[PDB]
Amino acid sequence: GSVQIVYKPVDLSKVTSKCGSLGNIHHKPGGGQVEVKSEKLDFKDRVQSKIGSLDNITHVPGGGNKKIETHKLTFR
Amino acid sequence: GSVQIVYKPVDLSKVTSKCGSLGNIHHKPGGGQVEVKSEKLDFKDRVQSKIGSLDNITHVPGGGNKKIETHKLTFR
Amino acid sequence: GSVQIVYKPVDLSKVTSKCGSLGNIHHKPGGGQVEVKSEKLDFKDRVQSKIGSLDNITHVPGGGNKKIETHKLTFR
Amino acid sequence: GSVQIVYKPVDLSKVTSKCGSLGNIHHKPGGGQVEVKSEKLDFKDRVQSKIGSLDNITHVPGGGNKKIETHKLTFR
Amino acid sequence: GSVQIVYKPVDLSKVTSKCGSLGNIHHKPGGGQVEVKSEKLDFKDRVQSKIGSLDNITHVPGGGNKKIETHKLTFR
Amino acid sequence: GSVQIVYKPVDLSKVTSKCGSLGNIHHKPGGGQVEVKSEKLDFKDRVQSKIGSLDNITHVPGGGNKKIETHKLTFR
Amino acid sequence: GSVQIVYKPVDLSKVTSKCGSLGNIHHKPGGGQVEVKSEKLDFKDRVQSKIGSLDNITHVPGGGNKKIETHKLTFR
Amino acid sequence: GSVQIVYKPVDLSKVTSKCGSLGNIHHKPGGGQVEVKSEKLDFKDRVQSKIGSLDNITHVPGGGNKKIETHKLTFR
Amino acid sequence: GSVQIVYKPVDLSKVTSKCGSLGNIHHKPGGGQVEVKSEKLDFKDRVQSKIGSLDNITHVPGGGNKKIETHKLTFR
C-alpha cells in the first residue's frame, strides 16, 4: 500500500564540563602475577576474547565527555 | 494500506558539570595474583569473553559526562 | 504500493569541555608477570582476540571528548 | 698464687642428615609495596639494620646442618 | 704467681649430609615498588645497613653445611 | 711471675656433602621500581651500607659447605 | 629342624574330542559404524587402553581343546 | 637346619582331537567405518595404547589344541 | 645348614590332531574406512602405541597346536 515513514529526530542537546586546575595524580601499581593455564582454544563466528591481560591505566582527559547515538530504521 | 508513521523525537536536554580544583589523587595497589586453570574453550556465535585479567585503573576526567541514545523503528 | 521512507535526522548538538592547567600526573608501574600456557588455537570467521598482553598506559588528552553516531536504514 | 688451669673439652659429636629426592618447591610472591617516610636518622655503635626493604628468599640446602662453638678462657 | 694454662680442646666432630636428586625449584617474584623518603642520614661506628632494597635470593647449595668455632684465651 | 701458656687446640673435624643431580632451578623476578631520597648523606667508621638496591641472586654451589675458625690469644 | 617338602603330583589325564564334518559356517555381519569424539588424552603410570576398535572374528578350530596348569611351591 | 625340597611332578597327559572335513567357512562382513576424533595425546610412563583399529580375522586351524604349564619353585 | 633342592619334573605328555580335508575357506570383507583425526602426540618412556591400523588375516594351519612350558627355580 501507500506506506509512509518519516524519520526526523531533532537534536539540540549539549554535553559540557568546566573544570579548574586538574592534576597532582599519582598511580603506583605494586606488580603481581596473571596466569592462565588451558587446553586447545576453539573460537567460531563473531567471538570477541581477552585472556591473561595485565593493565595499568592512568587516564586524565581535561574534558572526557561522551555522546553516543544509534539511529536505526529497518523495513521489510 | 495507507499506513503513516512519523518519528520525530525532539531533544533539547543538557548534561553539564562544574568543578573547582580536581586533584591530589593517589592510587597505590598492593600487587597480588590472578590465576585461571581450564580445559578446552569452545566459544560459538556472538560470544564476548575476558579471562584472568588484572587491572589497575586511575581515571580522572575533568568532565566525564555521558549521554547515550538509541532511536529505533522496525517495520514488517 | 507507493512505499516512501524519508530519513532526515537533524543534529545541531555539541560536546564541549573547558579545563585550567592539566598536569603533574605520575604513573610508575612496578612490573609483574603475565603468563598464558595453552594447546593449539583454532579461531575461524570474524574472531577478535588478545592473549598474554602487559600494558602500561598514560593518557592525558587536553580535550578527550567523543561523539559517536551510527545512522542505519535497511530495506527489503 | 701458683694457679693451674687445664682446658681440654673433647668433642666427638656428629650432626648428620640423609635425604631422598628434594624438590618440587615453588615460591611465587605477588609483589606489593614497602614504604618508609621519616625525619633525620642518627644510628650509632654496632647496629645491624634493614629499612623499608622487600625480600624474597628461597633457600634449599641439601644439607643445611649447623654446628657452632665458642670456647673462652679468661684469666686475671 | 707461677701460673700455668693448658688449652687443648680436641675436636673430632663431623657435619655431614647425603642427598638424592635436588631440583625442580621455582622462584617467581612479582616485582613492586619500594620507597624510603627521609632527611639527612648520620650513621656512625660498625653499622651494617640496607635501605629501600627490593631483593630476590635463590640459594640451592648441594651441601650448605656450616661449622663455626671461636677459640679465645685472654691472660692478664 | 713464672707464667706458662700452651695453646694446642687439635682439630680433626670434617664438613662433608654427597649430592645427586643438582638442577632444574628457575628464578624469574618480575622487575620492580625503587626510590631512596634524602638530603646529602654522612656516614663514618667501619660501615657496611646498601641504598636503593634492586638485587637478584641465584647461587647453586655443589658443595657450599663452610668452616670458620678464630684462634685469638691475648697476653698482657 | 630338618624341614622337608616333597612335591610329586602325578597327572595321567586326557582332554579329547571327536567330530564329524565341521563346516557350512557363515559369518556375514551387516557392517556398521564405530565413532569416538574426544578431547586431549592424558594417560600416566601403567595405563592400558583401547579406543574405537571394530572386530569381525571367525574362529573354527577342528580341535580347540585346552589344558592349563600352574604348579607353584614357595619357601621362606 | 637340613632343609630339603623335592620337585618331581610326573605328566603323562594328552590333548587330542579327531575331525572330519573342515571347510565351507565363509567370512563376509559388510565393511563399516571406524572414526576417532581427538585433541593432543599425552602418554607418560608404561602406557600401552591402541586407537581406531579395524580387524577381520579368519582362523581355521586343523587342530588348534593347546597345553600350557608354569612350574615355579621360589626359595628364601 | 645343609640346604638341598631337587628339580626333576618328568614330562611325557602329547598335543595331537587329526583332520580330513582342510579347505573351502573364503574371506571377503566389504572393505570399509578407518579414520583418526588428532592434534600433536607427546609420548615419553615405555609408551607402546598403535593408531589407525586396518587388518585382514586368514590363518589356516594344518596343525596349529601349541605346547608351552615355563620352568623357574629362584633361590636367595
Numbering used by the authors:
A (entry chain G), B (entry chain E), C (entry chain C), D (entry chain F), E (entry chain H), F (entry chain A), ...: 304 to 379
The authors write:
Residues 297–391 (using the numbering of the longest human brain tau isoform) constitute the proteolytically stable core of paired helical filaments (PHFs) from the brains of individuals with Alzheimer’s disease. Here we use time-resolved cryogenic electron microscopy to study the in vitro assembly of recombinant truncated tau (amino acid residues 297–391) into paired helical filaments of Alzheimer’s disease or into filaments of chronic traumatic encephalopathy. At the end of both assembly reactions, most intermediate amyloids disappear and filaments with the same ordered cores as those from human brains remain.
During the next 3 h, additional types of filament formed. Finally, by 720 min, most filaments had adopted the same ordered core as that of PHFs extracted from the brains of individuals with Alzheimer’s disease, although triple helical filaments remained in some replicates.
